[PDB]
């Protein structure tokens, strides 16, 4: 019998409106079986319902028809095309339109053993017992490995679900436990509450032996923090974060959170970051738990901003959701937005406005490239859905969102969001919704369709003749007729005021009230685009670097060295004049500017390293230190200061020892050698343990006692310093070592995996080992993090990306053309192509002014 249904979408007719999900876990069989309960309305006759199912075993599936006395039942007959991911089931009669039924489906599955889907994640305790736990990853398209249903974010339903344990575990959901009764056979079945109107990808259960602590906001939501009974003491920090950023957005939004409880839950194994589950945010345990002895400036940075996304996400996705894929950044881009907003509120103390530029240049290196898609960008099958989980719908999303409130004005932009969600609560959005909320409180809708239906962004060219300023626009491409709505900002030497130009066309020009020493355009870099200046231009902003940075924020100092080097790539400056500008880092303080230096500069010595260039390369790295050299000096062995000091001193001091600077490594020698001798009982500060670390795992001695303290660690931060410092050593047997055990789990966890193949892919002698495993290993890899999914994108890019000539580009492109269905059509595989042929143009056109330039410094 041929399958009823050939689209991967479904059948608009047939509506779900609740679900009652009874799902019993046998954990220790990693058997599950569940029946599910959909009531559903048909607008049109039919005799089939087409829903999603993927590896679930159907036994029994039955149409039900009104309650009790009136109860009527018909058997339905199941048909699969696991292909589509879909099921039919067939009635003997047509439903009666608008009439109520409820669909009975009873099915099996096994647990899986990927990071999706209703999956297994296990733990071992301080006391060395495995401990097996089950726990949820659904979105964007994993709720059909779990229950079958209709999974695509526009049907909304409420969900009652009901989980059958044994009395050991514990068992959390979405929604508040209302009852748990003693069922046959020693089980006990958890009841929660109903949900409100929600997409299936939000739905999760976790079945688990988790320690909680609880802290309840100003408007009675009781918060809670789950982990591991070893790590909840690591819970507070991100507890009363979860409070305060809670509280901010009711307040900010002027909509409550419409839950009892707020749970956030630390996962042992995750792919990746975090998910906003309504009612049961998860995390991997690095991004929620804090080690006040331990723990990284950094990671208390990465903590606060993935709890302040995760909650956004509680109106910005769960309450409003995206109508479909194509239009995730209305999810991601906001939430990833209103991290900023939120924190810089909350969190004052950690400066986090200050570092939201850094995202945009993020964005702009994928989006510079042919292979780069617009923000809102068609997408049908799971893989393709998977991809928009990127940097364009994350980092570009919200860049486009920061110019446009700045365009606006933050209260305008404020009662645009507030009008957005209030009006679409419990309903999905596309584009043009946001569009027409914005504009409700002036143009909205021809900007931002400019920002948000084209790929890339503009490059602006200013010209200045005495009064005159003349500006232009195009496409920056590396490697057509684009034109933008851009909010031009500028300040000059004679008034530090933005002044505003919205230029709308290809070129325009303004007249300055009078003539200017230095003009600089995208202030602060709210804007996504970069600026070239003609004639005297970039010597005149290069000498007032040199004389007086300070002129200028911290932050458009790091924007006029990004664009510099950016220039480089397209021809419009020379590498000689960008690399003079970067001789004013010399007397720079600021971590943003130095950062940005580090991100244009380390780069080009990553090409040299997989390349015969040791004499230039070497001559290369000792310009970099000398550059940093005073900065370096300054630098003291504590955790002192503020989170920008500490960030500044732990990268400075690990750049200084990686480069082999004597004064550095003997500090980072004498500390791990008092370390080493104290049995790793000693508290070192923790800003300096990258450094000592990595110093330490150079002799196989220091490797091998570094390792061995891996395994009692209950730190996050110190597992990582301790990952990237054991990625470090030269011994390729050791790095081998490092890919096989991570890739197989057990000393070292698969959700490491991806950081370790790209730490690996960055070692001046392992790399090769990395590319090689990831070919030799595709399949495995794939079925563990699945095709399209940003953990292959940052395997294949951490691998690849640092080529630079013709016969590794054939490398990359044969590799992945012989994958067809399985490979050759990823997005990252075209842009790590699209990369590579950069690097061969941009070190065939610089390499020698490089060696030249570096003769006469
Ligand atoms: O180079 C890298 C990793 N890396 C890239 O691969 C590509 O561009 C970058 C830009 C800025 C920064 Br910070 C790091 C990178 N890390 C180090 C290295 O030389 O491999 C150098 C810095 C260290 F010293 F802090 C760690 C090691
Ligand atoms: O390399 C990374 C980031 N990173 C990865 O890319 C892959 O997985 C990791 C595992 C452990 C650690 Br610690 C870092 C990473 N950051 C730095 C760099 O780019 O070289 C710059 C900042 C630094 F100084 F804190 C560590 C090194
Ligand atoms: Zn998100």
Redesign the pocket.
């Known amino acids: 019998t041929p399958f009823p249904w050939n689209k991967i979408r479904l059948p608009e007719y047939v509506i779900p409106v609740h679900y009652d999900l009874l799902i019993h876990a046998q954990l220790t069989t990693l058997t599950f079986w569940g029946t599910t309960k959909v009531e559903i309305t048909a607008s049109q006759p039919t005799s089939t319902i087409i829903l999603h199912s993927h590896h679930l075993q159907i036994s029994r599936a039955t149409l039900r028809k009104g309650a009790g006395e009136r109860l009527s039942e018909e058997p339905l007959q199941v048909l699969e095309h696991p292909r589509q991911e879909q099921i039919a089931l067939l009635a003997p009669e047509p439903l009666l339109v608008g009439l109520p039924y409820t669909v009975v489906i009873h099915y099996a599955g096994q647990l899986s053993e990927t990071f999706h889907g209703f999956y297994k994640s296990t733990y071992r305790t301080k006391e060395g017992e495995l401990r097996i736990l089950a726990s949820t990853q659904f979105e964007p398209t994993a709720a059909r490995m779990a229950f079958p249903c209709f999974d695509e974010p526009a049907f909304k339903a409420s969900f009652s679900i009901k989980i059958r344990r044994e009395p050991r575990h514990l068992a959390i959901s979405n929604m508040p436990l209302v009852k748990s009764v003693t069922v046959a056979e020693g089980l006990i079945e958890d009841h929660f509450d109903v949900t409100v109107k929600m997409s299936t990808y939000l739905v999760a259960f976790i079945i688990s032996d988790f320690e909680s602590v609880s802290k309840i906001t100003k408007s009675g939501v009781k918060v809670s923090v789950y982990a591991v009974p070893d790590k909840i003491n690591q819970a507070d920090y991100a507890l009363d974060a979860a409070v305060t950023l809670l509280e901010f957005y009711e307040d900010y939004f002027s909509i409550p959170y419409p839950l009892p409880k707020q749970d956030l839950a630390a996962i042992p194994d995750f792919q990746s970051g975090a998910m906003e589950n309504w009612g049961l945010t998860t995390y991997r345990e690095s991004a929620l738990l804090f080690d006040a002895e331990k723990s990284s400036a950094s990671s208390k940075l990465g903590i606060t901003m993935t709890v302040a996304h995760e909650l956004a996400h509680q109106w910005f996705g769960n309450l409003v959701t995206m109508e479909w894929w194509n239009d995730l950044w209305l999810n991601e881009g906001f939430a990833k937005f209103m991290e900023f907003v939120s924190v810089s509120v909350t969190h004052p103390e950690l400066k986090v406005g200050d570092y939201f530029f850094g995202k945009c240049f993020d964005a702009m290196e994928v989006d510079a490239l042919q292979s780069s898609h617009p923000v809102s960008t068609p997408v049908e099958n799971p893989a393709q859905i998977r991809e928009m989980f990127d940097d364009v719908s994350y980092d570009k999303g919200a860049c486009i969102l920061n110019m446009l409130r700045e365009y606006l004005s933050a209260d305008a932009f404020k009662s645009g969001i507030v009008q957005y969600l209030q009006k679409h609560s419990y309903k999905n959005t596309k584009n043009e919704d946001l569009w027409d909320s914005m504009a409700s409180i002036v143009d909205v809708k021809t900007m931002m369709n400019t920002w948000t239906l084209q790929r890339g962004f503009p490059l602006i060219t200013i010209t200045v003749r005495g009064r005159n300023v003349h500006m232009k626009q195009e496409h920056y491409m590396k490697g057509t007729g684009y034109l933008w709505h851009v909010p031009l900002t500028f300040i000059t030497s004679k008034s530090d005021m933005v002044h505003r130009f919205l230029l709308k066309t290809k070129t325009d020009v303004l007249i300055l009230p009078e003539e200017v020493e230095w003009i600089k355009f995208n202030v602060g870099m709210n804007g996504y685009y970069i600026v070239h200046y003609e004639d005297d231009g970039w010597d005149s902003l290069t000498g007032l670097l040199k004389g007086t940075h300070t002129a200028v924020s911290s932050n458009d100092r790091a924007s006029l060295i990004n664009n510099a080097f950016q220039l480089v790539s397209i021809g419009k400056l020379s590498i000689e004049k960008a690399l003079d500008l970067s001789l004013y880092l010399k007397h720079e303080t600021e971590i943003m500017p130095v950062?940005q230096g580090?991100?244009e500069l380390?780069?080009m010595?990553?090409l040299m390293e997989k390349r015969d260039m040791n004499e230039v390369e070497t001559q290369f790295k000792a310009f970099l230190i000398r550059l940093l050299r005073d900065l370096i000096d300054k630098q003291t062995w504590t955790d002192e200061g503020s989170v920008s000091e500490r960030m500044l001193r732990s990268?400075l001091l690990?750049?200084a020892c990686?480069?082999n600077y004597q004064p550095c490594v003997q500090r980072a020698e004498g500390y791990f050698r008092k370390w080493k001798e104290s049995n790793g009982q000693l508290s070192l500060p923790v800003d300096v343990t990258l450094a000592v670390f990595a110093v330490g795992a150079q002799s196989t001695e220091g490797w091998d006692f570094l390792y061995s303290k891996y395994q009692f660690s209950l730190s996050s931060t110190e597992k990582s310093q301790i990952e990237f410092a054991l990625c470090r050593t030269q011994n390729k047997e050791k790095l081998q070592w490092l890919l096989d055990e991570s890739f197989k789990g057990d000393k070292i966890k698969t959700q490491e995996f991806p950081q370790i193949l790209t730490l690996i892919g960055?070692?001046?002698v392992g790399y090769p080992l990395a590319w090689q495993f990831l070919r030799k290993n595709w399949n495995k890899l794939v079925q563990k993090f699945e095709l399209g999914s940003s953990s292959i994108a940052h395997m294949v890019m951490g691998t690849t990306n640092?080529f630079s000539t013709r016969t590794r580009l054939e490398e990359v492109k044969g590799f992945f053309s012989s994958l067809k269905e399985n490979g050759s059509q990823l997005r990252c595989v075209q842009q790590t192509i699209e990369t590579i042929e950069e690097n061969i143009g941009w070190m065939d056109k610089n390499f020698d002014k490089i060696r030249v330039w570096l003769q006469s410094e």
């Open positions: 950062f580090l991100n380390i780069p010595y990553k990268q690990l750049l990686v480069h960055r070692n001046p640092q």
